[PDB]
Amino acid sequence: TATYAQALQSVPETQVSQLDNGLRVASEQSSQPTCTVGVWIDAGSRYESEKNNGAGYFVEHLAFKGTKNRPGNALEKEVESMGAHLNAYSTREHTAYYIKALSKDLPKAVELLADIVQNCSLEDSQIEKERDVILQELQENDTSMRDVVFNYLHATAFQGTPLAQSVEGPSENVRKLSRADLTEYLSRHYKAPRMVLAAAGGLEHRQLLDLAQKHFSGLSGTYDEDAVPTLSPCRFTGSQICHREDGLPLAHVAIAVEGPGWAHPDNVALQVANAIIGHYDCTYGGGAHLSSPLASIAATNKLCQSFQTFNICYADTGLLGAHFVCDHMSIDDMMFVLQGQWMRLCTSATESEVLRGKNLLRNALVSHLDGTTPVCEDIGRSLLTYGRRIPLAEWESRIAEVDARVVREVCSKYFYDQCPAVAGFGPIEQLPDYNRIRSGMFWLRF
Amino acid sequence: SHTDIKVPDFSDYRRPEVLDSTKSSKESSEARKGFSYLVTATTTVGVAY
Amino acid sequence: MLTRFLGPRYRQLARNWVPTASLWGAVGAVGLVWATDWRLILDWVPYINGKFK
Amino acid sequence: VSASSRWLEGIRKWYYNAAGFNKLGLMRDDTIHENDDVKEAIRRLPENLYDDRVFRIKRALDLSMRQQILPKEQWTKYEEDKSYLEPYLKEVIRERKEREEWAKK
Amino acid sequence: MLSVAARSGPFAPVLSATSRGVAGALRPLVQAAVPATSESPVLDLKRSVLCRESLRG
Amino acid sequence: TNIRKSHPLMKIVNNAFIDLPAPSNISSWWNFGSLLGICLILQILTGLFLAMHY
Amino acid sequence: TNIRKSHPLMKIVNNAFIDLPAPSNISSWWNFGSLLGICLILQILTGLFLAMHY
Amino acid sequence: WALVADLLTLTWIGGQPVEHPYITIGQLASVLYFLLILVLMPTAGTIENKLLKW
Amino acid sequence: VPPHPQDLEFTRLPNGLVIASLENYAPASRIGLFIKAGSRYENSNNLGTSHLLRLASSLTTKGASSFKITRGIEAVGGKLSVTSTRENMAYTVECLRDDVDILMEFLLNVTTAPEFRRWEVAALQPQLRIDKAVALQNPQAHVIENLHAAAYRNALANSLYCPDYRIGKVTPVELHDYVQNHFTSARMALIGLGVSHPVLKQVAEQFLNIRGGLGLSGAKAKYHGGEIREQNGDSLVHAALVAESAAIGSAEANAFSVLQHVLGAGPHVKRGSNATSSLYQAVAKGVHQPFDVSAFNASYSDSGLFGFYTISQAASAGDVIKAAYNQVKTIAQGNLSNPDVQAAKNKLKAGYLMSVESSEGFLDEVGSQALAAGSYTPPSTVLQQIDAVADADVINAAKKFVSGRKSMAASGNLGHTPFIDEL
Amino acid sequence: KAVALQNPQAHVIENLHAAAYRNALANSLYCPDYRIGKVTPVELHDYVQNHFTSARMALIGLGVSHPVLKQVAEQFLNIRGGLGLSGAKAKYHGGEIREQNGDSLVHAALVAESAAIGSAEANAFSVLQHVLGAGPHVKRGSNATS
Numbered sequence A: 001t002a003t004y005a006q007a008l009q010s011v012p013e014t015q016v017s018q019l020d021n022g023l024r025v026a027s028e029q030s031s032q033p034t035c036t037v038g039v040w041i042d043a044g045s046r047y048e049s050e051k052n053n054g055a056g057y058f059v060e061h062l063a064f065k066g067t068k069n070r071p072g073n074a075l076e077k078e079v080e081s082m083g084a085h086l087n088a089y090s091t092r093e094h095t096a097y098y099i100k101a102l103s104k105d106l107p108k109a110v111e112l113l114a115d116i117v118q119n120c121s122l123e124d125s126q127i128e129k130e131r132d133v134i135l136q137e138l139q140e141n142d143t144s145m146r147d148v149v150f151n152y153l154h155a156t157a158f159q160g161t162p163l164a165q166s167v168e169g170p171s172e173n174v175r176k177l178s179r180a181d182l183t184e185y186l187s188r189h190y191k192a193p194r195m196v197l198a199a200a201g202g203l204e205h206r207q208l209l210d211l212a213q214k215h216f217s218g219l220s221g222t223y224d225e226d227a228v229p230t231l232s233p234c235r236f237t238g239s240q241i242c243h244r245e246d247g248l249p250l251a252h253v254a255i256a257v258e259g260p261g262w263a264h265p266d267n268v269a270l271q272v273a274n275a276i277i278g279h280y281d282c283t284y285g286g287g288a289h290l291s292s293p294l295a296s297i298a299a300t301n302k303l304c305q306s307f308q309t310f311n312i313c314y315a316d317t318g319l320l321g322a323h324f325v326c327d328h329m330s331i332d333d334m335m336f337v338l339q340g341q342w343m344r345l346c347t348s349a350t351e352s353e354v355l356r357g358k359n360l361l362r363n364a365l366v367s368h369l370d371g372t373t374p375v376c377e378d379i380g381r382s383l384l385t386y387g388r389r390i391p392l393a394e395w396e397s398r399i400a401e402v403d404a405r406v407v408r409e410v411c412s413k414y415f416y417d418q419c420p421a422v423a424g425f426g427p428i429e430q431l432p433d434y435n436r437i438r439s440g441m442f443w444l445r446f
Numbered sequence B: 001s002h003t004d005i006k007v008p009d010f011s012d013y014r015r016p017e018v019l020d021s022t023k024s025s026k027e028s029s030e031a032r033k034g035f036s037y038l039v040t041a042t043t044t045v046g047v048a049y
Numbered sequence C: 001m002l003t004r005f006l007g008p009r010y011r012q013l014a015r016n017w018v019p020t021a022s023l024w025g026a027v028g029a030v031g032l033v034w035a036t037d038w039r040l041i042l043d044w045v046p047y048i049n050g051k052f053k
Numbered sequence D: 001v002s003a004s005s006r007w008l009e010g011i012r013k014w015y016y017n018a019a020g021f022n023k024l025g026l027m028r029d030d031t032i033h034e035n036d037d038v039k040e041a042i043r044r045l046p047e048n049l050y051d052d053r054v055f056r057i058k059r060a061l062d063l064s065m066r067q068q069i070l071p072k073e074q075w076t077k078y079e080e081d082k083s084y085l086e087p088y089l090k091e092v093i094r095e096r097k098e099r100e101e102w103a104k105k
Numbered sequence E: 001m002l003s004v005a006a007r008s009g010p011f012a013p014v015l016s017a018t019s020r021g022v023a024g025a026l027r028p029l030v031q032a033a034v035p036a037t038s039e040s041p042v043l044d045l046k047r048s049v050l051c052r053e054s055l056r057g
Numbered sequence F, G: 001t002n003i004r005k006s007h008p009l010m011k012i013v014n015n016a017f018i019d020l021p022a023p024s025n026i027s028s029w030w031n032f033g034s035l036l037g038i039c040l041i042l043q044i045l046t047g048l049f050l051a052m053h054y
Numbered sequence H: 001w002a003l004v005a006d007l008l009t010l011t012w013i014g015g016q017p018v019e020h021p022y023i024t025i026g027q028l029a030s031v032l033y034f035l036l037i038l039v040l041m042p043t044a045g046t047i048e049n050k051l052l053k054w
Numbered sequence I: 001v002p003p004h005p006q007d008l009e010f011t012r013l014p015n016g017l018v019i020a021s022l023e024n025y026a027p028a029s030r031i032g033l034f035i036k037a038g039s040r041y042e043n044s045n046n047l048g049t050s051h052l053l054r055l056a057s058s059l060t061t062k063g064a065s066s067f068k069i070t071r072g073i074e075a076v077g078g079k080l081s082v083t084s085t086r087e088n089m090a091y092t093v094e095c096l097r098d099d100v101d102i103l104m105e106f107l108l109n110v111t112t113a114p115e116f117r118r119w120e121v122a123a124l125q126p127q128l129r130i131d132k133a134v135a136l137q138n139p140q141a142h143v144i145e146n147l148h149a150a151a152y153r154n155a156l157a158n159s160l161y162c163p164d165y166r167i168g169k170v171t172p173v174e175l176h177d178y179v180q181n182h183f184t185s186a187r188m189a190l191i192g193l194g195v196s197h198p199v200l201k202q203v204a205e206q207f208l209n210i211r212g213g214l215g216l217s218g219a220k221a222k223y224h225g226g227e228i229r230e231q232n233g234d235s236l237v238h239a240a241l242v243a244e245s246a247a248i249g250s251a252e253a254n255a256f257s258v259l260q261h262v263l264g265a266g267p268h269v270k271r272g273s274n275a276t277s278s279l280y281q282a283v284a285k286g287v288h289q290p291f292d293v294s295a296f297n298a299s300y301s302d303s304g305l306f307g308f309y310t311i312s313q314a315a316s317a318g319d320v321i322k323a324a325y326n327q328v329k330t331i332a333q334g335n336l337s338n339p340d341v342q343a344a345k346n347k348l349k350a351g352y353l354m355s356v357e358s359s360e361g362f363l364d365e366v367g368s369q370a371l372a373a374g375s376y377t378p379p380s381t382v383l384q385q386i387d388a389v390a391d392a393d394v395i396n397a398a399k400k401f402v403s404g405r406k407s408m409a410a411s412g413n414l415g416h417t418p419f420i421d422e423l
Numbered sequence J: 001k002a003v004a005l006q007n008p009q010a011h012v013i014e015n016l017h018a019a020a021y022r023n024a025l026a027n028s029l030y031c032p033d034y035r036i037g038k039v040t041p042v043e044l045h046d047y048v049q050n051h052f053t054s055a056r057m058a059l060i061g062l063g064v065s066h067p068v069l070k071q072v073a074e075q076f077l078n079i080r081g082g083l084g085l086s087g088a089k090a091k092y093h094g095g096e097i098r099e100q101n102g103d104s105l106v107h108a109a110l111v112a113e114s115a116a117i118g119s120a121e122a123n124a125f126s127v128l129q130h131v132l133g134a135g136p137h138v139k140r141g142s143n144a145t146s
């Protein structure tokens, strides 16, 4: 049989083409009877000002509700009738609209995607209906303690920059954003050099290219004009937001140092180090015996309900750290053990646990790129962020290079003696003071 | 509606090399800790004497 | 009997802590020399000279 | 079938009688030092063996206070001495040494 | 087409060593958070939503 | 609720000298600990009254 | 689980001098308590070195 | 009990002048003090373990 | 430009065990052992035993300790999972290609050599409570458990989760007895993705030759009918209405599958009106507040349950149930267009093809097929099987639901939720 | 609730009434678990003000005079601002409720709709109850006429 090493070579190359307006069109072909197609746009809340914050989110609500060719429910009627799935998401940096469909349905699926992007018929009555829907969604998101702390951590880490803003916007923006605000956003941002037609599945690249010229070519043939549109770095702070609510039964805490952006090679080693610390929740089988010292100590001594490590990437910055959920009498112990692990990895990381993290990352990467949809997302996202698709064999090369020395170097660079951003929500009396969290970021013994 | 929470302006209290929100703090990071640790380093030297 | 602490990980862990343990010795040597005014060592030090000539 | 293994057994029986925990109705495994390996082995013991052990130790600590000893008929015979803790203890030692082998890598 | 959860409706639970517990199938609550005020009590002596072993390069 | 059990000073006395669980069991060889304390205060008390004139 | 928090001696130090919840609030007039302690050990230390020759 | 009696031996020698029989037997008692604690008592414990099939 | 893909290979051994494998040339391998060991095989003396079993997979085996299973799997970045239906348990195992042997060894140990040590079993009992608590945070879990308890006398009435009174009370013997009478050759399937067929066949012949157990897909499930009601005041009422339908891999089951997509399963568009969902439009007509409706379709070895599931406001529940039930009645009366069956056929076909896109969905489909049918049915003959469903068949499935003795479970403020006789 | 529900009879007869009725008589004597902590001062006030009224009350006294009671009633028990009937009428439904225990013993009750209190038919039920057999009459007896 093939090895793991051989198996990565046998993964077929992503084919890339540029259309004349600057729309990139990209496809990974497999043998599958189904596909995923979609448009990834370099647009999100980081591009929005104070006054139009939440516009893209508003557009996301309007994108599927009618076009100039397919008014009202006509689009969803066509998607439903062929058994397709039409989906969307919005982050701080990326918007996506994608269709899960039969491979024989890729002609119509590309035709619909173009119709959504170019020809959004934002009828005044529809934008009024969506006002109340988004407002209710804000009330819903208030009850998710995870979503609140991560919004809080962004709001404090990126303090006075566009990365501080939520995707959905404030409620005053939701109730006063006009159609003209929305079309101005669409005009400025939905432009061909900034968006990617991605596909994965049972398709030739040739026909993906054909359909791209067929349906997308009226986008930026002479629309390459106005201030097109530089992002600018976001100042990370080192600060604390503490929403004390003793009426909630569990504390949420998220803590992060400033990460580097999408581009940086340091991400691979940081991800290895994050894998060593890992994740946990209360439904994990066998707690005491888990490899991660944090996960093991948390399970045995009932220190939390869950934790997760993360490395959120933006352009030229990010959030590197962890989040947890615990009882009111446990925040101090959780924070102690978390910080000790960061410190341990900076100073005294060893060969064996780094192998375990390396292996966890190969297993995560490969297990993630499994299905037409995650592969299509990855084609789309990667061309926005790296400008290539980075093939699986390259990641393996980048993973393999990481050893204990790299983990000690790269963790020290971002973690050791750095100011964290801290976000606390719930019963947080026992959340350590910021000075004492700052003091947890170095070791007196080292 | 938790999305109505902005962190208030801290310009009044900020170190001068950290007032530009358009510019990275990582650059002034070594300097700012440098100044504050030099204070404690000199104090320890002073107390040591 | 101490054989628990002998293997590749503890060899790496000792190697990591060696520059630190060396520097903590270097801290303590100078600190002893400074506290006692250790005449033997401080005669070498080209500007610290309380004894004339 | 050995004269010499009968001899070692007779030195062992001699030592057993000299040790004199059997005089208080104790078994050997009642007298073991409670370290972390041993505390866990005790934790792992089934209901009946647990409850027998506490009473034997109760009876011994009672006698040791009175500075008295059981009637000879009621001393635990060396041949009747059940090694009831040992298999659990071996397993607890076996599990720890596996952990310690993993901590080495 | 022989599989109860792929038929989409009846209930399946998953346990693991490294990954969060899962429940269930196709009962509705995807066109139910769409007309809104389904708050759903999200985070009260409770596991993690969305699952994690799905990390990037 | 006992005065002996909850008063912040008597707490210390109770958990050392009164309610402290001790073996049924300990012989005359365990008497020497208290005897060392008696010795300590005897030497303190006489030593004080000698210091008054030395 | 912290060494500072559970060691029977350091427990006492931690619950008095480190983790002790104190008002955000107390002014310079609250400095005199520690100053009395400093005074106490200053007088003990000098008093000892005077007793060596008196 | 060899340790107690050897200690009793050493306090007897301590009481005597540094002359003929006393120099050697005090040297042997010194050696026995350190040999009992370091070597002979740990070995006794192992033998006792082996005799109980432990 | 991909490689020309390998065919799946499939083997029934004389002892009844089924081995199926696919060499996708993938970086990772997936291996599952599928066992007819789900909750339906419990009885009234051992309820919850298959729950504790589902939680017990990293307890000590013969030459692999609890510590070793956790550490060894994690050292190579692997997973071990156990998923259960009312019919099956499924022990699956993932790693990179190079690491199959160690994870296979852990798998075989877990499934054929568990020790169920008294104290390990004891330390695990509280985990039933945590696991049940987390699962039962979704109101759907309460409803569908109560739905099955209401519907059946027997077997399929059993919960996926341990009854509260049994927590702390399931024994090492009951676990041993459960494995020894259910985890046997003629009740097992060994499926592997990214392994060779000779390696799997070899593993099966060396390590999976057990029998001293039961034979059938069980004591046969007796459909009873009835209703279970749980007062909450949860702001929302969850209700499910159901009748006996068709056993899995009968032709009639496909008719139920298609009717499910006429009436409407899940949504297709993020935030959409569900235009071609006939239940959703029917409720929407006379109800002007937040609701949901889906068709519900659960097919088993020897029975099925078809109908619908509603979420609505407490005061609206009666109206939502009656609008939904009338919409089914209207298809039973024959008002069903050829284009509507065809769209439902398109959703079902595409749904199924998307279902098997990933390794996880492929392996579970191949595993359950091997247990239900004794066979592997490729995608295109499933599609052929769906195509053969006549319009009359879908009318006939709706007729069967409307005329058949009902089962109902509901939870919420039930002050305006109807009983079965009020419908 | 915990103390009361230690008798298996309490579970059974509560479930029996819940099974039997749509309505009214289906309600438990004991608070549903989800309501514990959730019943309010307003709900208590509203309950007293619509049920504790003159036309819903009786004042009975043993070893008191009738003039004293009559006086007490006329001075202190003249309330109305409440409901009228013996209620929303109880709808008999029928059905079964099943609670798995393994309690060594099974408690079962089988029941049908009978007769309203102080109808002639209720006396027929009362007599049939003693044909079939109510409680025992003899300590440790065989219950010969039961």
Ligand SMILES: COC1=C(OC)C(=O)C(C/C=C(\C)CCC=C(C)C)=C(C)C1=O
Binding pocket: F016, F020, F022, F030, F031, F033, F034, F036, F037, F038, F040
């Ligand atoms: C658990 O064992 C204990 C004993 O049982 C054998 C004692 O008898 C005593 C009594 C000791 C006294 C009176 C000396 C106190 C010393 C000072 C410096 C005040 C103590 C404290 C003890 O802990």
Ligand SMILES: COC1=C(OC)C(=O)C(C/C=C(\C)CCC=C(C)C)=C(C)C1=O
Binding pocket: G016, G020, G022, G030, G031, G033, G034, G036, G037, G038, G040
């Ligand atoms: C809750 O308020 C407290 C303070 O806040 C104003 C203090 O500053 C101090 C510090 C006191 C010291 C160093 C004196 C110790 C005395 C002796 C005899 C060793 C203490 C104990 C205290 O309780």
